[PDB]
Write a protein that binds this ligand. Structure first.
Ligand code: ATP
Ligand code: ATP
Ligand code: K
Ligand code: MG
Ligand code: MG
Ligand code: MG
Lengths: 405, 594, 209, 406, 352
């Protein structure tokens, strides 16, 4: 069912540190690594194989303290064998000593694995040092594991703690990735056929991606395109150059579309199933067009000229950089620009001010500082050059003439 | 009673036996003309407003049907996978418009359809009451139960309890307003429990869909299966609601060209919103039933003649002073003038005839407008307008043949080939067929004869002269018709200042020209109130300003009162948005500069 | 006037109680602008019952006009009067005033949002309650906050509660957008009296000369 | 053997009573005399035991309390209360623990007390009590220091004998207390600083890694102790012992090193070897940021080199994605070669992955106020870490390294 | 023995019945209470001072002598109520206590406040006034103004540590001054009058150091009992040497002995911090600057090249024990480090 590949030193160190059941292990191991290096998988399979009483808890799902402590207590009570409620860490220690004394759990090491452990430090100051010292406080032969993506130096509190043993799960290289990806075989073809497909896939995608999950998902998606020449009959299994000539422009187009999730995976499968050309659609992006009223269009153009242009050139452009981001402007400058670009009388009615504060709620503008609300004139223009240039083309206005010389 | 060291004063009518309440419409009788007529006017207003509201909701539930069909197809196809069996969460990016105020009604139409077709478990969440993850999840779970420190496990327990197969659907109405963190946490928590809790997410988006990239990074947007949808345009729903609320004879109330110009300018320029247009028509209807005493006749025509039969003696004299009625008796013969002025029964009968003439004028005018729309829509380059509302405005302000713009439309209309003219005649004969009880019985037979006939140029100029003579006869402004004041509303300015006001113009006019509001020779081009002279003095170190104010007030008029007048007229100007202190001088600021 | 814009941009308070011998100059002229605005009271009372709300904008103090309005019409209602200019005023305080005095509830709520949900549900359960909220200042520094006006707008949207308000600041149309001006059905009415600010500016005289 | 692993795992992990006392004889004399004085007479005292992390505070108090309880009259009629500053974060929790640990939870019942001190006085009047306050510096971050005042006041004034021992790590502990509780605290300080040199550390290495005298199989214990005696004099052992002693004088780090060394002892490998200790030293001394940079892709490495060039030209100024992408484009269009001319969204995906690993920190954190680009950020890697990790990258292209030197 | 009874007399819990050196204050407070108890009138008094002066002991002595006066039928009988501000869980819990101290009834805080207002011979004493402060500040103003009424017939005494307290609140004022040389010497010789256990030069040293530093009596009693312990180790008579050992066992700061006893890399880190402050001239510097100096210092010392995961551990160890003041380590390499101690103490500790 579950087999671990290229993780042999790590399994050796973990199984050595666990020891026998009645032996005492470390109070805390902190495992760190990258985004897919078998942190959850190796630990969970290794604790399932050796038949060790363990509780696996995610910290993203438990966003409060009470949820985390009650999850640990209920899972341990399920292992030992209704509802135990604890509000504080003190009652958690007392009830944890209460539940562990059962006949199954007296003389073994109980494991509490905590996944996504970079969310514990945001909870409360006393929670992480309490879990680092849980063997000392409870005196009940307990090991606590911390699986994380952040290094340990970012975890240390200001007052110090008990130091865990810090372990590192190394990255997979290209040989390890090729060995892992070529194991869940498609049974209707041979082994070396799928191995050559994985070889050309990693030949394309290894520069930009080293994640096993994304590469496996891409290998699942692009495989019927690779094996349709042998279905049609133009090629055979031994004609590697024909297969790679077929697959490599498709793989260089899949990087721009599906890897960035513009065209969805189901849409991609439907396009190659229906034989429609890839990249024939807009996708989620390239739909940058919003339908605005007239005065909202000139308020947005006036804000874009207010934000990306210095105040010293205002009188030269209007009366008669693109790097470094926007520059904030006051409301009076916005209204001066707005009355200068519109070639008609504009009354300062309530709806124009409602438009100015409603463009903020649509995230097309952003107020900065928030010092005061009514007498707070600070605003920023958080939108790009192409969107504004298309709007200025809609209202027949030349934005490049007024941005810079 | 209204001022102690507390900011709230609750008052109750307790300890006295006045439990009875005052009924509504007693406030409608502020001007005494007749005691009975005002009650009938208020009932007519309520009836017409309920009819217009029901017609609007029927119209809006009609228009959104196709998008609902595509979305139900997506939901069933996406849940077929969980019916078979980590997967991605199925999401639909429903791109609503910028017209935010409409969206709630749209979501109502979206909810019940799903509750009839896909799931019985539909919930709607808003970002105003989800600041963090605990409030988000607490608000979600209770709306799940009605249709303790709950978690994500309580949701799975409730689902396993109630099913023992349909999905749950969560609609998040506004993507701009949610916090990033609660969205990321909800996606990450809900994705790993997809095997025992099937979740489908609809994302209500107001702007372009790239806002999904703005709030969610690539590490979290890879846990979703986004399929994009688009909703109905604001312009199409606007044209539909004018065609089914103003260009129909079913509703007797109409509005003048200037009021329509006011509402279309606050629609197209300021904000697309049909609910604001409906609110403008409600206020127009309310002030028309308020100001006009003989607007009780603005109802359905048999009821209108029944009301004409029974009136008071003053109401007949109110009919006699109408300007259209005055011009109408001016253009008649001599004996008919004293026949109408003296006897009121002949007055009642003649007004009964005139309302029916106005009603058949309205019917003929709307059908000829619908027929002219086909000609101007088939013709390219669209001079008068591509929309029915633009055509209705430009024919409503003045007759189109007096303008020289219609001659160019006719000249372009002579240069058409056979297939286009066949298409025009088919569409226009369909227009005549669609509206039954025609009073234009001859023209339907004429256009069916023209369609039957298929020297092409002579029949082409014949059909051009046919449509030209048709718009001579029946396109006609309502200001040249008798008793149109019964069923029309022309108060453009009051409606405009009630809906779309300008406080800074009012403050500037009051400060700069106090003679305008105080006509006692206060200004022609020193004699002013204190705030109005201090404002003109500054448009700013305080001591020199106080000496200038003292010079002006002693020129105009051991006291030590005038300096306190200066303190009050600066503190009052500072309570407004004009004066803000600054540390570079004793004061140096100019917040208006306009 | 972008032209003028670009160019231009390039005594104790205890005395004031005793020193109040100022005489208004146009007493007769300003006496005709108060009963002019007493005509509009019945239109306001009608339009409040149809679901609209009224905001008043002008140059002077509108507080006397609302105080006149209470004496004329609302003598048989459970009405609550709010002073935005009061220094220690909060939206939490108006919520305690509605909950504790009108409905006779005696308890402490966990948050302002839970208490807001409780008052909304209690008004939706029973339509026998009619309540009037007069707010003399809606633009003051305590009530400029977006969350406070979100609470007040969720209060005012129900059909058995009514609201009249007054704004004084120059940039008050900034503090409502399209989503919040759909909760308030505002009918803007210019009441441009020339009365001077005594109660509002009595606190302004504390922090200056 | 199994028993060697059992006894040494109980020695190093679950820190256990062992008879040896290392450089604390004066301090143990002071503490033992004061506790015996409190237990046999009616004196009431307060102590702050101050030391850094892992310097033997809990060992000293447990050993002193064990020797004190060996006396029979003390063991009959002395009660103890342990309170930790991590578990009890409020005075209500701490007061509930005082009622529970004194076995008076049934006695107090439903009785209501007007003040906290009335509750405590009702507790004490139903025989000396010794209070131990682990994490004492967290009890002085409470609201008004009700517990500290009410403990020191009863110790100073009331007849009831009480000892208040408080274990802390802060050297400024007498600057967090209020003036009134500083007045009632008798300033008796016991300092467990690490006052021992390197040959004494070598004796620590010998004495901890040695089997006891109650071990059953005597010949294996004898040859194990002789092998450890030989291993103490080995120069390769003393080099890594010198390195770990140079980092810190803490004994807890030494216990971690000994457990990693002893972990490599099986039935095939009965005795510890110098290579076991050197492998354990190599495990403990790894650099974490170099390990993270080793796992990155080529594009992220190019982004980090462009960021290094930005921090070298425009010194100590934060940057956004647009400047980084402009520098990387100045690479791909001219300096090296045509490929790696990737599009902007995949480069943005790599930049967001560098943000996820917290190798980049935002200059100002305002979510939603600004868009993804034009957000000013700062790099959290030094130049020499970049160069050293770049030399150890598995298959680094030559042009990327040549760009990095230039 | 001899030193055993010295430990019994020197204990703080052995308060004397008649206090030395505070006989004027007893007379003043007793006359202020006798001027209001015999004529059946009400008043208020405020007492202040630093905590070693002896306020509570003198107040309890005054109350004791008045109790014996009332028992001897000189003055009318009077009920005594005592409230301490620090012993209470909540500030409003005065009202539920005084009422329970006055009548049998128990209630909530506000209802007991109402019954206390409607109720107003009792002599109230409110120690620890500073914790009765609230933001509305009703407790303080009520506790002054009830006794100034004809119905209340109450005497309120208040004790606190700041003499300038009842002006921000908007009352006879009394101030206890801290003890000098001779008063402390008189207390210490009064406790050991019939016992030949101490040399007067030791009493001289203890009195002069305590009167120089703070001026408290508890410090004198603690240093004398600790010097008794030190003399008990060297076995008598408590000489000048044992008191000299006790005074710098209880007065000295242990920062320099902590810096001197640290490891090699921690001292090198401190030298890097000093070198960065000499190069810059400020009081804070980032971790990057200090590490850039520390690499050079470890290079010239001959130490191996330091990794940042090791130097960060050294910095966290020094900042944990409060020798340095550092930010949380969640942001790293941008930690501005400032010395908690003076530079001269560091150079005194590192030179040897
Ligand atoms: N050595 C391996 N052998 C077989 N499969 C593996 C191996 N390593 C990873 N996988 C597969 O890759 C998937 C992702 O790995 P895993 O979930 O352990 O990464 P992770 O480090 O926990 O991710 P994250 O950092 O997001 O928590 C797993 O579902 C597992 O099936
Ligand atoms: N001088 C010593 N003599 C004997 N053992 C010592 C000595 N110093 C340290 N140790 C050992 O090192 C460890 C010291 O940590 P201990 O738990 O005793 O206190 P601590 O860790 O300083 O307290 P805290 O948990 O508050 O930091 C113990 O295992 C102890 O056996
Ligand atoms: K309402
Ligand atoms: Mg994982
Ligand atoms: Mg300890
Ligand atoms: Mg005292």
């Amino acid at each position: 069912e579950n087999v671990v590949l290229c993780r042999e030193s790590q399994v050796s160190i973990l199984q050595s540190l666990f020891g026998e059941r009645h032996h005492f292990s470390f109070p805390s191991i902190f495992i760190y690594g990258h985004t897919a290096s078998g942190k959850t998988y190796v630990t969970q399979t290794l604790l399932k194989t050796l038949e060790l009483p363990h509780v696996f808890v995610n910290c993203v799902e438990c966003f409060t303290l009470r949820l985390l402590l009650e999850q640990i207590l209920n899972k341990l009570n399920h292992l030992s064998s209704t509802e135990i409620t604890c509000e504080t860490f003190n009652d958690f220690v007392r009830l944890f000593k209460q539940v562990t004394t059962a006949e199954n759990l007296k003389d073994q090491t109980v494991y509490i694995v905590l996944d996504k452990a970079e969310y514990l430090r945001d909870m409360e100051a006393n929670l992480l040092p309490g879990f680092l010292r849980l063997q000392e406080l409870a005196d009940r032969n307990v090991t606590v594991l911390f699986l994380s993506e952040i290094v340990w130096e970012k975890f240390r509190p200001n007052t110090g703690c008990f130091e865990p043993f810090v372990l590192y799960f190394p990255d997979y290289s290209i040989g390890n990735l090729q060995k892992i990806l070529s194991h869940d075989h498609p049974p209707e073809y041979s082994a070396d056929f799928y191995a050559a497909y994985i070889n050309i896939l990693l030949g394309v995608f290894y520069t930009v991606c080293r994640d096993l999950k994304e590469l496996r998902h891409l290998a699942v998606l692009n495989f019927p395109k690779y094996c349709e020449p042998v279905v049609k009959g133009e090629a055979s299994e031994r004609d590697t150059r024909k297969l790679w000539r077929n697959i490599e422009p498709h793989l260089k187009k899949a990087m721009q579309t599906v890897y960035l999730r513009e065209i969805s995976s189901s849409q991609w499968e439907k396009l190659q199933k229906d034989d429609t050309d890839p990249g024939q659609l807009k996708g989620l992006s390239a739909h940058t067009h919003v339908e605005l009223p007239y005065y909202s269009k000139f308020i947005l153009i006036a804000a874009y000229l207010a934000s990306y242009n210095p105040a010293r050139t205002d009188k030269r452009f209007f009366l008669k950089n693109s790097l470094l981001g926007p520059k904030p402007f006051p409301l009076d400058r916005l209204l001066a620009i707005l009355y200068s670009i519109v070639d008609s009388r504009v009354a300062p009615t309530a709806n124009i001010f409602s438009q100015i504060t409603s463009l903020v709620t649509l995230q097309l503008l952003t107020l900065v500082g928030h010092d005061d609300q009514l007498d707070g004139p600070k605003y920023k223009c958080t939108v790009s050059l192409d969107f504004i240039r298309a709007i200025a083309r809609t209202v027949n206005f030349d934005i490049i003439k007024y941005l810079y010389d | 009673t209204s001022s102690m060291s507390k900011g709230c004063f609750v008052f109750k009518p307790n300890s006295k036996k006045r439990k009875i309440s005052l009924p509504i419409e007693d406030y409608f009788n502020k001007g005494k003309n007749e005691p009975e007529d005002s009650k009938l006017r208020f009932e007519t207003y309520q009836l017409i407003w309920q009819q217009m509201k029901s017609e609007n909701e029927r119209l809006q539930e009609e228009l959104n049907k196709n998008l609902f069909d595509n979305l139900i197809e997506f939901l069933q196809k996406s849940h077929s996978g969980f019916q078979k069996n980590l997967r991605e969460i199925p999401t639909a990016a429903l791109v609503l418009g910028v017209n935010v105020t409409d969206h709630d009604l749209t979501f109502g139409s979206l909810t019940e359809a799903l509750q009839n077709n896909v799931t019985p478990y539909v919930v709607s969440l808003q970002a105003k009451d989800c600041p963090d993850m605990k409030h988000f999840l607490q608000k979600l779970i209770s709306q799940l139960m009605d249709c303790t420190h709950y978690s994500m496990d309580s949701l799975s327990s409730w689902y396993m309890t109630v099913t023992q197969s349909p999905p749950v659907v969560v609609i998040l109405k506004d993507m701009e307003s949610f916090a990033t963190k609660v969205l990321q946490d909800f996606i990450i928590i809900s994705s790993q429990h997809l095997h025992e809790f099937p979740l489908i997410l609809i994302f209500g988006i107001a702007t372009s869909p790239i806002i999904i990239h703005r709030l969610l990074p690539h590490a979290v947007s890879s846990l979703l299966c986004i399929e994009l949808f688009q909703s109905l345009s604001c312009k199409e729903h606007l044209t539909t609601v004018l065609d089914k609320l103003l260009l129909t004879t079913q509703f007797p109330f109409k509005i003048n060209e200037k009021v329509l110009q006011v509402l279309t300018n606050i629609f197209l320029y300021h904000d697309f919103s049909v609910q604001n247009f409906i609110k403008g028509l409600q206020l127009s209807l309310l002030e028309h039933f308020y100001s006009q005493p003989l607007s009780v006749l603005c109802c359905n025509l048999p009821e209108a003649k029944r009301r004409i039969n029974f009136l008071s003696n003053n109401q007949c004299e109110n009919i006699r002073r109408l300007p259209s009625f005055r011009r109408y008796v001016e253009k008649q013969a001599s004996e008919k003038q004293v026949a109408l002025l003296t006897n009121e029964r002949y007055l009642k009968e003649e007004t009964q005839l005139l309302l029916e003439n106005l009603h058949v004028y309205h019917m003929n005018y709307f059908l000829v407008l619908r027929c002219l729309h086909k000609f101007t829509s088939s013709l390219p380059k669209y001079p008068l307008g591509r929309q029915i509302r633009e055509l209705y405005c430009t024919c409503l302000e003045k007759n189109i043949w007096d303008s020289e713009e219609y001659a160019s439309v006719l000249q372009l209309l002579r240069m058409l080939a056979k297939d286009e003219l066949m298409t025009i005649l088919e569409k226009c004969f369909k227009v005549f067929k669609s509206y039954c009880e025609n009073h234009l019985g001859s023209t339907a037979k004429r256009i069916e004869e023209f369609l039957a006939q298929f020297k092409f140029e002579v029949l082409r100029e014949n059909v051009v002269n046919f449509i030209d003579c048709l718009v001579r006869e029946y396109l006609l402004p309502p200001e040249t018709q008798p008793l149109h004041e019964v069923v029309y509303f022309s108060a453009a300015h009051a409606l405009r200042e009630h809906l779309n006001a300008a406080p800074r113009i009012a403050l500037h006019t009051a400060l700069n020209n106090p003679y305008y509001y105080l006509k006692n020779e206060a200004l022609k081009s020193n004699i002013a109130p204190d705030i109005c002279i201090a404002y003109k003095l500054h448009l700013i170190n305080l001591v020199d300003w106080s000496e200038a104010f003292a010079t002006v007030v002693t020129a105009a008029e051991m006291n030590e009162i005038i300096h306190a007048r200066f303190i009050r007229a600066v503190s009052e100007l500072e309570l407004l948005g004009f004066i803000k202190p600054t540390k570079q001088k004793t004061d140096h600021v100019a917040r208006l500069t306009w | 006037l972008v032209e003028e814009y670009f160019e231009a941009h390039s005594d104790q308070q205890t005395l004031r109680n005793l020193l109040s011998k100022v005489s208004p100059s146009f007493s007769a002229e300003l006496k005709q602008l108060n009963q002019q605005y007493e005509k509009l009271f019945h239109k306001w009372m009608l339009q409040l019952h149809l679901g609209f709300n009224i905001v008043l904008y002008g140059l002077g103090s509108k507080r006397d006009l609302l105080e006149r309005f209470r004496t004329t019409m609302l003598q048989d209602s459970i009405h609550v009067v709010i002073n935005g200019f009061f220094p220690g005023i909060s939206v939490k305080s108006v919520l305690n005033s509605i909950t504790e005095e009108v409905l006779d509830h005696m308890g402490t709520f966990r948050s302002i949002l839970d208490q807001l949900d409780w008052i909304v549900n209690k008004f939706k359960e029973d339509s026998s309650l009619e309540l009037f909220l007069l707010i003399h200042n809606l633009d003051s520094q305590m009530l400029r906050g977006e969350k406070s006006q979100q609470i007040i707008g969720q209060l005012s949207s129900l059909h058995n509660i009514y609201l009249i308000a007054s704004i004084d600041h120059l940039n008050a149309p900034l503090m409502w957008d399209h989503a919040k001006q759909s909760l308030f059905n505002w009918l803007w009415y210019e009441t441009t009296t020339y009365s001077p600010y005594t109660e509002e500016t009595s606190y302004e005289n504390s922090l200056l000369v | 053997l199994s028993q060697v692993q059992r006894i040494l795992r109980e020695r190093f992990c679950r820190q256990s009573p062992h008879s040896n006392l290392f450089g604390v004889q004066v301090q143990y004399k002071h503490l033992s005399e004061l506790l015996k004085r409190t237990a046999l007479h009616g004196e009431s005292n307060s102590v702050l035991i101050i030391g850094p992390r892992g310097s033997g505070k809990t060992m000293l108090i447990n050993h002193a309390l064990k020797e004190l309880m060996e006396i029979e009259e003390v063991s009959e009629n002395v009660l103890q209360v342990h309170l930790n500053g991590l578990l009890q974060i409020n005075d209500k929790i701490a007061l509930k623990e005082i009622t529970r640990q004194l076995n008076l939870e049934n006695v107090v019942g439903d009785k209501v007390f007007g003040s906290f001190a009335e509750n405590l006085s009702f507790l004490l009047e139903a025989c000396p009590v010794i209070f131990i306050l682990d994490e004492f510096d967290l009890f002085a971050h409470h609201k008004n220091q009700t517990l500290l005042y009410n403990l020191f006041d009863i110790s100073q004034s009331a007849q009831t004998p009480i000892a208040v021992i408080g274990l802390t790590c802060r050297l400024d502990i007498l600057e967090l207390l209020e003036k009134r509780v500083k007045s009632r605290f008798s300033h008796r300080q016991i300092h467990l600083m690490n006052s021992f040199g390197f040959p004494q550390y070598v004796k620590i290495f010998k004495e901890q890694l040695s089997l006891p005298a109650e071990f059953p199989d005597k010949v294996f214990a004898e040859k194990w102790n002789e092998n450890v005696q030989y291993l103490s004099e080995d120069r390769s052992v003393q080099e890594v012992l010198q390195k770990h002693f140079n980092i810190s004088k803490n004994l807890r780090s030494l216990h971690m090193l000994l457990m990693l060394a002893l972990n490599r002892v099986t039935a095939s490998h009965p005795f510890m070897t110098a290579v076991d200790l050197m492998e354990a030293s190599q495990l403990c001394s790894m650099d974490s940021k170099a390990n993270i940079v080793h796992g990155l892709s080529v594009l992220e490495i190019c982004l980090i080199i462009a960021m290094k060039h930005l921090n070298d030209i425009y010194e100590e100024e934060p940057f956004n994605f647009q400047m980084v992408y402009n520098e990387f484009q100045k690479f791909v269009q001219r300096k090296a070669h045509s490929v790696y001319n990737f599009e902007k969204p995949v480069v943005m995906k790599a930049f967001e992955h560098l943000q996820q690993l917290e190798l980049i920190k935002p200059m100002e954190r305002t979510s939603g106020n600004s868009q993804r680009e034009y957000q000013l950020m700062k790099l959290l890697l030094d130049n020499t870490q970049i160069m050293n990790a770049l030399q150890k990258y598995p298959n680094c292209p030559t042009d990327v390294r040549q760009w990095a030197t230039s | 023995s001899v030193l055993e009874e010295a430990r019994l007399r020197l204990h703080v819990s052995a308060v004397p019945e008649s206090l030395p050196c505070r006989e004027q204050e007893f007379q003043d407070i007793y006359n202020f209470v006798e001027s209001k108890l015999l004529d059946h009138t009400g008043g208020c008094m405020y007492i202040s001072g630093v905590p070693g002066t002896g306020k509570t002991a003198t107040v309890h002595e005054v109350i004791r002598c008045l109790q014996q006066a009332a028992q001897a039928n000189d003055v009318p009988p009077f009920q005594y109520i005592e409230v301490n501000g620090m012993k209470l869980t909540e500030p409003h819990q005065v009202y539920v206590q005084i009422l329970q101290k006055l009548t049998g009834q128990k209630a909530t805080a506000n209802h007991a406040a109402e019954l206390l207002a409607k109720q107003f011979t009792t002599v109230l004493l409110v120690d620890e006034l500073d914790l009765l402060w609230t933001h509305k500040q009703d407790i303080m103003y009520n506790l002054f103004d009830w006794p100034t009424h004809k119905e209340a017939r109450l005497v309120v005494l208040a004790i606190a540590n700041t003499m300038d307290l009842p002006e921000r609140i908007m009352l006879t004022r009394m101030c206890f001054q801290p003890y000098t040389y001779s008063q402390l010497q008189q207390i210490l010789r009064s406790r050991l009058k019939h016992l030949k256990a101490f040399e007067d030069d030791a009493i001289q040293l203890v009195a002069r150091k305590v009167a120089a530093l703070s001026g408290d009596a508890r410090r004198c009693l603690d240093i004398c009992r600790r010097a008794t312990e030190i003399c008990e180790f060297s076995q008598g008579l408590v000489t000048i040497a044992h008191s000299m050992e006790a005074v710098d066992e209880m007065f000295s700061s242990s920062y320099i002995t902590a810096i001197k006893n640290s490891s090699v890399l921690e001292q090198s880190f401190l030298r890097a911090i000093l070198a960065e402050f000499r190069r810059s001239g400020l009081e804070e510097a980032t971790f990057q600057q200090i590490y850039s100096q520390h690499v050079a210092l470890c290079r010239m010392e001959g130490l191996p090249y330091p990794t940042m995961s090791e130097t960060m551990a050294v910095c966290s160890h020094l900042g944990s024990c409060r020798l340095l003041l550092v930010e949380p380590s969640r942001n790293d390499l941008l930690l501005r480090v400032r010395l908690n101690v003076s530079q001269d103490d560091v150079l005194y500790a590192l030179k040897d």
